[PDB]
Write a protein that holds these residues in place. Structure first.
Motif, PDB file in Angstrom:
ATOM      1  N   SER A   1      29.605  62.796 -65.544  1.00  0.00           N
ATOM      2  CA  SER A   1      28.617  63.813 -65.869  1.00  0.00           C
ATOM      3  C   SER A   1      28.661  64.966 -64.864  1.00  0.00           C
ATOM      4  O   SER A   1      28.273  66.086 -65.177  1.00  0.00           O
ATOM      5  CB  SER A   1      27.208  63.198 -66.013  1.00  0.00           C
ATOM      6  N   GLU A   2      29.172  64.690 -63.671  1.00  0.00           N
ATOM      7  CA  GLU A   2      29.284  65.699 -62.614  1.00  0.00           C
ATOM      8  C   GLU A   2      30.532  66.585 -62.783  1.00  0.00           C
ATOM      9  O   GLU A   2      30.557  67.712 -62.277  1.00  0.00           O
ATOM     10  CB  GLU A   2      29.308  64.992 -61.257  1.00  0.00           C
TER      11      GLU A   2
ATOM     12  N   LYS B   1      24.044  67.873 -67.767  1.00  0.00           N
ATOM     13  CA  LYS B   1      23.605  66.993 -66.710  1.00  0.00           C
ATOM     14  C   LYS B   1      23.430  65.626 -67.328  1.00  0.00           C
ATOM     15  O   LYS B   1      23.596  65.465 -68.542  1.00  0.00           O
ATOM     16  CB  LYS B   1      22.277  67.495 -66.115  1.00  0.00           C
ATOM     17  N   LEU B   2      23.113  64.634 -66.503  1.00  0.00           N
ATOM     18  CA  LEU B   2      22.712  63.308 -67.016  1.00  0.00           C
ATOM     19  C   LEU B   2      21.200  63.187 -67.232  1.00  0.00           C
ATOM     20  O   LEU B   2      20.399  63.407 -66.298  1.00  0.00           O
ATOM     21  CB  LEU B   2      23.146  62.246 -65.979  1.00  0.00           C
TER      22      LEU B   2
ATOM     23  N   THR C   1      27.496  48.061 -64.475  1.00  0.00           N
ATOM     24  CA  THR C   1      28.686  48.373 -63.692  1.00  0.00           C
ATOM     25  C   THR C   1      29.177  49.774 -63.961  1.00  0.00           C
ATOM     26  O   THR C   1      29.551  50.521 -63.032  1.00  0.00           O
ATOM     27  CB  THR C   1      29.812  47.363 -63.951  1.00  0.00           C
ATOM     28  N   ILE C   2      29.113  50.162 -65.228  1.00  0.00           N
ATOM     29  CA  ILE C   2      29.681  51.431 -65.643  1.00  0.00           C
ATOM     30  C   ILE C   2      28.716  52.611 -65.396  1.00  0.00           C
ATOM     31  O   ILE C   2      29.153  53.762 -65.335  1.00  0.00           O
ATOM     32  CB  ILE C   2      30.219  51.375 -67.115  1.00  0.00           C
ATOM     33  N   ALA C   3      27.431  52.332 -65.207  1.00  0.00           N
ATOM     34  CA  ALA C   3      26.437  53.401 -65.048  1.00  0.00           C
ATOM     35  C   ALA C   3      26.793  54.452 -63.980  1.00  0.00           C
ATOM     36  O   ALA C   3      26.716  55.639 -64.255  1.00  0.00           O
ATOM     37  CB  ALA C   3      25.049  52.807 -64.785  1.00  0.00           C
TER      38      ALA C   3
ATOM     39  N   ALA D   1      29.248  68.898 -70.385  1.00  0.00           N
ATOM     40  CA  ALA D   1      28.737  68.259 -71.620  1.00  0.00           C
ATOM     41  C   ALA D   1      27.366  67.745 -71.248  1.00  0.00           C
ATOM     42  O   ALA D   1      27.025  67.677 -70.047  1.00  0.00           O
ATOM     43  CB  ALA D   1      29.620  67.131 -72.045  1.00  0.00           C
ATOM     44  N   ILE D   2      26.558  67.371 -72.256  1.00  0.00           N
ATOM     45  CA  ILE D   2      25.258  66.769 -71.971  1.00  0.00           C
ATOM     46  C   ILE D   2      25.443  65.263 -72.016  1.00  0.00           C
ATOM     47  O   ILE D   2      25.915  64.730 -73.028  1.00  0.00           O
ATOM     48  CB  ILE D   2      24.185  67.212 -73.006  1.00  0.00           C
ATOM     49  N   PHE D   3      25.124  64.579 -70.914  1.00  0.00           N
ATOM     50  CA  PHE D   3      25.300  63.136 -70.812  1.00  0.00           C
ATOM     51  C   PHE D   3      23.977  62.444 -70.957  1.00  0.00           C
ATOM     52  O   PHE D   3      23.038  62.767 -70.250  1.00  0.00           O
ATOM     53  CB  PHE D   3      25.959  62.754 -69.473  1.00  0.00           C
ATOM     54  N   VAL D   4      23.875  61.513 -71.886  1.00  0.00           N
ATOM     55  CA  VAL D   4      22.575  60.990 -72.291  1.00  0.00           C
ATOM     56  C   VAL D   4      22.606  59.467 -72.190  1.00  0.00           C
ATOM     57  O   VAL D   4      23.553  58.875 -72.671  1.00  0.00           O
ATOM     58  CB  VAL D   4      22.253  61.411 -73.752  1.00  0.00           C
ATOM     59  N   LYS D   5      21.616  58.879 -71.527  1.00  0.00           N
ATOM     60  CA  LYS D   5      21.475  57.417 -71.523  1.00  0.00           C
ATOM     61  C   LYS D   5      20.369  57.011 -72.484  1.00  0.00           C
ATOM     62  O   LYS D   5      19.295  57.593 -72.444  1.00  0.00           O
ATOM     63  CB  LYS D   5      21.175  56.920 -70.116  1.00  0.00           C
ATOM     64  N   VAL D   6      20.667  56.025 -73.353  1.00  0.00           N
ATOM     65  CA  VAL D   6      19.681  55.495 -74.308  1.00  0.00           C
ATOM     66  C   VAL D   6      19.624  53.957 -74.201  1.00  0.00           C
ATOM     67  O   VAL D   6      20.604  53.251 -74.500  1.00  0.00           O
ATOM     68  CB  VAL D   6      19.989  55.928 -75.739  1.00  0.00           C
ATOM     69  N   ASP D   7      18.491  53.451 -73.750  1.00  0.00           N
ATOM     70  CA  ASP D   7      18.223  52.003 -73.758  1.00  0.00           C
ATOM     71  C   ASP D   7      17.907  51.619 -75.176  1.00  0.00           C
ATOM     72  O   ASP D   7      16.914  52.060 -75.717  1.00  0.00           O
ATOM     73  CB  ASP D   7      17.074  51.704 -72.781  1.00  0.00           C
TER      74      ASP D   7
END
Length: 108
Positions: free
Chosen positions: A50-51, A5-6, A41-43, A55-61
């Protein structure tokens, strides 16, 4: 549930904790900044990917998780890192969703 998931991390140490218990999954990390227009834009397109892929989709600021950004040698944003079986396996530097998908297909 599934870990495929995201998710959005909160503090340094989170990514390590994830990888400690999901070494067998492909992990795709979007290192982004809030001062990065192309990252905005790409988010939604990263969420679409991710759908489709297990795979595991990870956002990191990079400003929230500064040590993690440093450790993965991040400079340009967005940078997408592919991580599998205990190590980094690939990257895409810049806001190119097509190349991110190619990387996932290559390493999943």
């Amino acid at each position: 549930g599934s870990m495929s998931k995201l998710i959005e991390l909160k503090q340094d140490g989170d990514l390590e904790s994830l990888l400690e218990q999901h070494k067998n999954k492909l992990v795709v990390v979007d290192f982004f900044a809030t001062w990065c227009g192309p990252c905005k834009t790409i988010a939604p397109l990263f969420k679409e990917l991710s759908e489709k892929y297990d795979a595991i989709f990870v956002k990191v600021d990079v400003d929230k998780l500064e040590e993690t950004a440093r450790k993965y040698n991040i400079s340009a944003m967005p940078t997408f890192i592919a991580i599998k079986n205990g190590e980094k396996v690939g990257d895409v530097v810049g806001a190119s969703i097509a190349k991110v998908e190619d990387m996932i297909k290559k390493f999943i």
